[PDB]
Design a protein around this ligand. Structure first.
Ligand code: COH
Ligand code: COH
Ligand SMILES: *[C@@H]1O[C@H](CO)[C@@H](O[C@@H]2O[C@H](CO)[C@@H](O[C@H]3O[C@H](CO)[C@@H](O)[C@H](O)[C@@H]3O)[C@H](O)[C@H]2NC(C)=O)[C@H](O)[C@H]1NC(C)=O
Ligand SMILES: *[C@@H]1O[C@H](CO)[C@@H](O[C@@H]2O[C@H](CO)[C@@H](O[C@H]3O[C@H](CO)[C@@H](O)[C@H](O)[C@@H]3O)[C@H](O)[C@H]2NC(C)=O)[C@H](O)[C@H]1NC(C)=O
Ligand SMILES: *[C@@H]1O[C@H](CO)[C@@H](O[C@@H]2O[C@H](CO)[C@@H](O)[C@H](O)[C@H]2NC(C)=O)[C@H](O)[C@H]1NC(C)=O
Ligand code: BOG
Ligand code: NAG
Ligand code: NAG
Ligand code: NAG
Lengths: 552, 552
């Protein structure tokens, strides 16, 4: 019986066993002291007393529109506030990384082996009184029963923030470059060895695959013209492997950076758009540098698209999610006078937290047509029939589902929801409340406090028994949403540090990289700093249709 | 005719071609402006006028012994001084890394591909008038003529700092965990994907190899008992690949972390010593943690040995090399309030700089025996015959050769010296003076100034014709040595930044790692804080013989 099974060390203290039945807490630089690191120093009490709650800060950022309008248009003020948002978030992240699924203590194996997802909290020891430590019952509830009673959609619940399918598929497309679970190996392992925004889902994970996708003229990527429009090349032509069922004919097997993007037309849509953007940038650079060769044109274009991606994700994507009247800003210079590590390791909990299944609709609405899940998946024929323009117009206006609030997961992906729970247990995640404490949030003291409701909280009580036994994934989906919001508190407060760290931690944001020469001059640099979700569609989609991450 | 062939940009500005006929210098954050980044800004002019020369600083640090004795014993001042030497040196290194042999511009391939050595200076462009850019003759002088006329040892020149064989072999053993050139692939590539002090030369580069070397009992590494003492296991026993010529019998084919360490008995000596130290620490930790399993004992011991290594390298190895009266200090906490990147990429020029062939003696004296290179190389029988105790006593008393000053490379390793020159040209190194400017040193204006002597300078002038045409590796070895020192100015001013950055950049120095719990408690921390070259030998060599990096 491991002495640290009770997770006795508080406030990010480190538990270490000293003997078979005793433990010791390392309170170094926690701001606390005592046996469990639970007694605050003088300075710590003052900081705590003066620290406003996340909900308070959230209220201020989502109100006083007249105030933020002025702040947004004064760089001095906007920079100082954005600088605060960045610094205070990333400090909750261990960098360089620490634990993974196989190590609850610091080890060189955990640090050096990039095949693992890292871990924000160490795994629960193998031999503990309960699966989660000491709290709860000897056996966790049946994972399918959790999904059915708490997560399954009885009736479609639209997102009150108005997120659309353009947002939903952007989210899936973007995150699947660093969420690349090596399932044949196990949920603890990833294929994304770059561990961040490298755009491997466009260019490929290895040089061998990249060379299959490249045209080797003017720095461009291979493509084909169908009905006058640019689309990805075929598998037969590139010999770049893709995941396709037998029923998909050869001429419809599109080859892109990510092997699984043929699964759903929504992904292939963004894959096509980003492909168009790369070759567009190549033309721009070739005009600016007629002396450059194919290789430098390719490499510089890739760096620019990485910049565009981070720019769009912060100022459009995260901006939409936050609901802030304050306008977030992508500016690496904000950190040049701060302590910050330019590196990133993808955490398993970050992956799990991003299982935003409830976003998915009951049917997919393209033009005047509707498709069920069986018709939609692996169906590139739909994409060619309607075209990218029609796809953009339809997805922009189709609303997505609310993620928090419970019971909004489509039955079509019921087994996927269960898988998230099963894998979480396989990797021995700690409880939901342990993760709330890990990110300096007060733990919930009752099921009713979690959901803000009596029905689902009663079912939670019947299943888990104790609030400290509730698991991470289901609790995130049943958590009381913030007022008219898509998420609950925990989703934001745990997710934002991971998100922002991986964005600003990118190498191109470092002082040695963030300069005009890196991107082929001011022309390439400007492409990055003026990028938006609207400009991406306008530049690469016929007719330049209106688009947004929110419904009109 | 690349317009950047002349390397027009000064002070670490970035050169970029604009059209076929012109270039543009990016002076971002160089502290300079103008077309070539040559004109200093206001504060820059001030800092220049208030900053002394490295030779002036070196004088101060090597004199006023009574003064430094006072300084060394007042922690607050000693910490401030040591903090400054860490931050100022590491600032000259690009981190995250930039260029490599294949990329003279920033690219994702250069950043992400760990198989390359990184580069402090970008390679000379392919289409330049001269091999070095625009300076010098169209063809570089014969590499063998350079070795013969300038580098080959006539009479043995001993190190005036009194470095011994314990020092020479420690340097080779220590640096060959990150200097691991993949010669079958090219000099531009490395097998040390950890790019630093991971002690892979003990434990192996991969997990597969590590498992072959581990005992899986009490966290220990496999070993055998010969004549009552601990030695590495064999290849036959472990099935771990080693590089050995056919004439080496099976029982003399020892298996260690680094595949080439069977090449020299001096390397196998330190391999044996560090092996013993691992198993020693395992015994200490097991006494402290009876509840721990094999895996935790192994991993914790490895972290401790990494700590010991960095401690010894700073406070004994670099301390001896420097010749300073100021006492250097290994203390990660010195950087906790500073801007510092906890990562490292091994530079090709750092490798070339560390080719300290002149250290090698004419013969290897062990007890009453003398061995030439034919008798010594790949001869592990010598190690077993004398034992580690006799090895330590002999090598402690045998003096090493002077590195700078020219004409001190043993003819036995003549081709190695030629290979260093050939590989540098193959990797398209820039000139010696370009690298001086890269590390804020003034360029030599004449051969006579470089050598401080009329003989070899005349030979240099005949070979190269231009001082700006002299290559990095030959100039390092012929440079005028500092008064009674082993090195010249450039070796120290270029070498120290790379060296210190790789040491303090280590992850165990990071705030999240530098705490007692990481090393198994206070006992693990004390092992590190009490580490020395003396204690390393005393703890693991029979009889506890005295040792040092200098001749008694
Ligand atoms: C963030 C938004 C998001 C969306 C909109 C979305 C939309 C959809 C969708 C739309 C038609 C379908 C059929 C599915 C179905 C799946 N999802 Co998602 N998923 C999303 C987030 C994720 C994440 C994150 C994972 C884990 C990936 C991993 O570990 O490789 C995931 C995994 C899966 C898997 C497991 C295999 C795999 O994808 O590698 C299936 C199947 N799914 N999901
Ligand atoms: C303290 C520095 C030091 C020492 C003591 C030392 C001592 C000895 C020694 C007997 C003691 C012998 C027989 C050799 C012989 C060789 N050394 Co060194 N070498 C040293 C510094 C280096 C470095 C640096 C390299 C290149 C590392 C790489 O790329 O693998 C090297 C590589 C070599 C090579 C391969 C060529 C090459 O990598 O370019 C041979 C052969 N050698 N050396
Ligand atoms: C430091 O953390 C310790 C671990 O959480 C904590 O010990 C825990 O104390 C609680 C109550 O104080 C115990 O909870 C149960 O105790 C008995 C079982 O012996 C039950 O009858 C109770 O109803 C209650 O459910 C935990 O069992 C106990 N955990 C241990 C000992 O591992 C310490 O109190 C903490 N110390 C400080 C100063 O905060
Ligand atoms: C890091 O850069 C390495 C150097 O570019 C790169 O190694 C190269 O890998 C490719 C593809 O694996 C090899 O390409 C061809 O190799 C042989 C020719 O010798 C062909 O028969 C194959 O079919 C293949 O097309 C290169 O040979 C190889 N080059 C070298 C010098 O090793 C690595 O792949 C890069 N690392 C990553 C992770 O991408
Ligand atoms: C990173 O960790 C994984 C998992 O431990 C290592 O993969 C194992 O490698 C050994 C030896 O090659 C195999 O016998 C196992 O079957 C592998 N396990 C799995 C789950 O794949 C991997 O080798 C490690 N990476 C490195 C570079 O050592
Ligand atoms: C869409 C429902 C599929 C799963 C049904 C079996 C699990 C029981 O689901 C039940 O659903 C009821 C109506 O939503 C709820 O009121 C109950 O709390 C819940 O237990
Ligand atoms: C895919 O979508 C098309 C719509 O163009 C439809 O005709 C077809 O039946 C769908 N299913 C497939 C191809 O399995
Ligand atoms: C910059 O350097 C180039 C080549 O070294 C030289 O021709 C040019 O005159 C320099 N420009 C200035 C402004 O000094
Ligand atoms: C190796 O050393 C042994 C003595 O230790 C000696 O007898 C033998 O000749 C040496 N080998 C060579 C090739 O010189």
């Amino acid at each position: 019986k491991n002495p640290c099974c009770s997770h006795p060390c508080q406030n990010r203290g480190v538990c270490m066993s000293v003997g078979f039945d005793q433990y010791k807490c390392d309170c170094t630089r926690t701001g606390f002291y005592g046996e469990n690191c639970s007694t605050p120093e003088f300075l710590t009490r003052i900081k705590l007393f003066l620290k406003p709650t996340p909900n308070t800060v959230h209220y201020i950022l989502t109100h006083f529109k007249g105030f933020w309008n002025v702040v947004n248009n004064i760089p001095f003020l906007r920079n100082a506030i954005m600088s605060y948002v960045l610094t205070s978030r990333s400090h909750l992240i261990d960098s360089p990384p620490t634990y993974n699924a196989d190590y609850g203590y610091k080890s060189w194996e955990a640090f050096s082996n990039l095949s693992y997802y890292t871990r924000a909290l160490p795994p629960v020891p193998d031999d503990c009184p309960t699966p989660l430590g000491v709290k709860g019952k000897k056996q966790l509830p049946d994972s399918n029963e959790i999904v059915e009673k708490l997560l399954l959609r009885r009736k479609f619940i639209p997102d009150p923030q108005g997120s659309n399918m353009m947002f939903a598929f952007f989210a899936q497309h973007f995150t699947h470059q660093f969420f690349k679970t090596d399932h044949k190996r196990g949920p603890a392992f990833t294929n994304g060895l770059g561990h961040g925004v490298d755009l491997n889902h466009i260019y490929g994970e290895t040089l061998a695959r990249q060379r299959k996708l490249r045209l080797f003229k003017d720095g461009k990527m291979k493509y084909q013209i169908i009905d006058g429009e640019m689309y990805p090349p075929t598998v037969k032509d590139t010999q770049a492997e893709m995941i396709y069922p037998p029923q998909v004919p050869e001429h419809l097997r599109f080859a892109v950076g990510q092997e699984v993007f043929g699964l759903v037309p929504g992904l292939m849509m963004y894959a096509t758009i980003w492909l168009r953007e790369h070759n567009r940038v190549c033309d721009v650079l070739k005009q600016e540098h007629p002396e450059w060769g194919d290789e430098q044109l390719f490499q510089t274009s890739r760096l620019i698209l990485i910049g565009e991606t981070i720019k769009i994700v912060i100022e459009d994507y995260v901006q939409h999610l936050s609901g802030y009247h304050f306008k977030l800003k992508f500016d690496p210079e904000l950190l040049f006078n701060k302590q910050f590590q330019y590196q990133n390791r993808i955490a398993a909990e970050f992956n799990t937290l991003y299982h935003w299944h409830p976003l998915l609709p009951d049917t997919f609405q393209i033009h005047d047509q509707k498709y069920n899940y069986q018709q939609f998946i692996y169906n590139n024929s739909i994409l060619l029939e309607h075209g990218i323009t029609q796809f953009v117009e339809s997805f922009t206006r189709q609303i997505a589902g609310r993620v928090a609030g419970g019971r909004n997961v489509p039955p079509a992906v019921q087994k996927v929801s269960q898988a998230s729970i099963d894998q979480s247990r396989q990797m021995k995640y700690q409880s939901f409340n342990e993760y709330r404490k890990r990110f300096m949030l007060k733990p919930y003291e009752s099921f009713e406090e979690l959901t803000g409701e009596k029905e689902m909280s009663a079912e939670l009580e019947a299943l888990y028994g104790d609030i400290d036994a509730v698991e991470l994934y289901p609790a995130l989906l049943v958590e009381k949403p913030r007022p008219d919001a898509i998420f609950g508190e925990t989703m934001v407060e745990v997710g934002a540090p991971f998100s922002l760290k991986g964005l600003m931690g990118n190498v191109i944001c470092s002082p040695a990289y963030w300069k005009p020469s890196t991107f082929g001059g001011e022309v390439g640099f400007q492409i990055i700093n003026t990028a938006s979700i609207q400009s991406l569609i306008c530049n690469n989609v016929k007719g330049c249709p209106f688009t947004s991450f929110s419904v009109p």
